């Protein structure tokens, strides 16, 4: 139908964990899940960015 | 089942050790929570016993949680030494119950004192129409020695509760010789 | 005490940390060479070479 | 027959200890085991020289 012109804000220690968990594990790859507040349609945040555990095979 | 709370709350001051109160007085009160811990056991386990003292600090090691295996095995090297502040211990219990996970839960807690407290008797007042402010029952068992018929804690007993709220029940101690489950059967008949 | 100098071992490509040791280090041509087939020559078939 | 129901209640202490040993045996282990699930279901190896 129609929708509005989303955004997604940040809280920076979330960028802050991603470099240092990037940096942690630095010649592998890593994947986590990402934690916030869906505020609304325009907007949503990322408040918090927390460790996810290693896998090794894939 | 019923929905709880029930704070022991243990002696580790250095009254404890000898044995007028059957083979130790720290197996006596080892026995206490043994039979408290079996039966929250036999309650409901939604329910959480937590660990604390009154004497020579306010030491929780356990949180408030619905195992006692843990505690099983924190029964041993007690060792009660220190001086008793059981008029702390009220408060230190409560606001380790008013750091629970619900609020259907009830809120018995039992008491073991077993020491001469310098406790006001405005204190234990201050305390009880605090508790009747509060909404928790509690049925303190007289252990160890302070007088052969405590008075203070019979105050806090009659303080605590009126015409509806009569949870507060005293096994005063009988400081000879009596047994390990004489003692506690008495609160397992009613509390 | 089971790694002496030149051995195999099985090492992941990402951690790049070993977690095998190897048995072989062998051509398959050697493995090519071993008989296994056993032909049935008696020596009652050679006549004369005693 | 004091001190036999004493070591009668010691051995129920020790069964407690045996739990114990059960306890930090089991779960540290199966932890362990999980860490080793981890690093070594990874089953592309390279192999190399030491």
């Known amino acids: 139908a129609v929708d509005t012109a989303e955004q997604v804000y940040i809280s920076s220690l979330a960028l802050l964990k991603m470099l240092k968990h990037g940096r942690a594990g630095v010649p592998m790859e890593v994947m986590g899940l990402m934690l916030g507040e869906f505020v609304d349609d325009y907007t949503v945040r990322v408040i918090d960015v927390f460790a996810m555990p290693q896998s090794g095979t894939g | 089942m019923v929905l709880e709370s029930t704070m022991v709350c243990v002696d580790n001051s250095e009254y404890m050790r000898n044995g007028?109160?059957?083979?130790?007085?720290?197996?006596?009160?080892?026995?206490?929570?043994?039979?408290?811990?079996?039966?929250?056991?036999?309650?409901?386990?939604?329910?959480?016993?937590?660990?604390?003292?009154?004497?020579?600090?306010?030491?929780?090691?356990?949180?408030?949680?619905?195992?006692?295996?843990?505690?099983?095995?924190?029964?041993?090297?007690?060792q009660p030494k220190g001086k008793i502040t059981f008029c702390t211990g009220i408060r230190v219990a409560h606001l380790a119950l008013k750091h629970r996970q619900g609020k259907n839960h009830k809120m018995r807690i039992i008491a073991f004192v077993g020491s001469p407290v310098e406790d006001n008797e405005?204190?234990?007042?201050?305390?009880?129409?605090?508790?009747?402010?509060?909404?928790?029952?509690?049925?303190?068992?007289?252990?160890?020695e302070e007088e052969v018929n405590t008075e203070k804690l019979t105050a806090f007993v009659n303080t605590l509760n009126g015409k509806d709220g009569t949870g507060s029940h005293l096994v005063t101690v009988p400081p000879g010789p009596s047994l390990a489950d004489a003692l506690i059967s008495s609160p397992i008949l009613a509390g | 005490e089971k790694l002496k100098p030149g051995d195999l071992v099985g090492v992941n490509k990402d951690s790049y940390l070993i977690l095998e040791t190897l048995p072989t280090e062998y051509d398959s041509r050697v493995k090519a060479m071993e008989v296994d087939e056993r032909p049935t020559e008696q020596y009652s078939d050679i006549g004369g070479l005693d | 027959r004091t001190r036999l129901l004493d070591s009668e209640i010691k051995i129920m202490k020790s069964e407690v200890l045996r739990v114990t040993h059960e306890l930090q045996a089991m779960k540290d282990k199966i932890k362990e085991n999980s860490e080793k699930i981890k690093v070594n279901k990874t089953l592309p190896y390279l192999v190399s020289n030491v």
Do not use: M, W, Y
């Not at chain 2, 007028?20 to 016993?49: G, M, W, Y």
């Not at chain 2, 937590?50 to 004497?55: C, D, E, M, Q, V």
């Open chain 2, 20 to 78: 007028d109160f059957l083979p130790t007085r720290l197996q006596a009160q080892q026995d206490a929570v043994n039979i408290v811990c079996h039966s929250k056991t036999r309650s409901n386990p939604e329910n959480n016993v937590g660990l604390i003292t009154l004497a020579n600090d306010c030491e929780v090691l356990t949180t408030l949680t619905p195992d006692t295996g843990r505690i099983l095995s924190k029964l041993h090297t007690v």
């Open chain 2, 122 to 144: 405005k204190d234990l007042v201050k305390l009880a129409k605090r508790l009747k402010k509060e909404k928790v029952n509690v049925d303190i068992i007289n252990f160890g």
